[PDB]
Amino acid sequence: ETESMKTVRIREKIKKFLGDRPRNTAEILEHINSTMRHGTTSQQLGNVLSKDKDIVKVGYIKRSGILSGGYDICEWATRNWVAEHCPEWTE
Ligand SMILES: [Cl-]
């Protein structure tokens, strides 16, 4: 019922989802929100992903344009996935 309990539940779902390969924030949000009653927002999810040390940011695209407006897309992986697939990587 608590916000922490929800956040813990969300973290476990995200980690399972990211098991196979890295995914972008939009894909993660769609997955999470497809399997929870209320789910979360892209802003809140970004915070959760950043705060969870088991889930690491592996890429980014930022777009800006006089027509595009601006947006970012971030790519995330589990730390263990990175350790296994990029064994020269460190942070
Ligand atoms: Cl929920």
One DSSP character per residue, 24-41 reads: EHHHHHHHHHTSSSS---
Chain mean position to CA 49: 5
Kindly give the distance from the C-alpha atom of residue 40 to the centroid of ligand 1, in angstroms, as a whole number: 7
Q: How far apart are CA 73 and CA 4, in angstroms?
A: 26
Phi and psi for 11 in degrees, rounded to 5?
Answer: -55, -45
CA distances from 8 to 54, 65, 69 (A): 12, 37, 34
Domains of the chain: total: 1
By the CB criterion, residues less than 5 angstroms from ion ligand 1 are 36-38
Residue 17 CA, ligand 1 centroid: distance in Å:
17
Tokens read off for 49: 């992903």
CA angle (59, 86, 57) in 5-degree steps: 25
For residue 37, report the distance from its CA to the centre of ligand 1, in Å: 4
Angle at 11 between CA 5 and CA 82, to 5 degrees: 160
Q: What is the span of the domain harbouring residue 37?
A: 1-91
- The domain spanning residue 2 has which CATH number? 1.10.10.10
Cβ–Cβ < 8 Å for 58, 22: yes
Contact 62, 70 (CB under 8 A): yes
Among the listed residues 27, 36, 25, the one whose alpha carbon sits nearest the alpha carbon of residue 7 = 36
Contacting residues for 63 by C-beta, under 8 A, at least 6 apart: 70, 71, 72, 73
If you measure from the C-alpha of residue 69 to the centroid of ligand 1, how many angstroms do you get, rounded to a whole number?
31
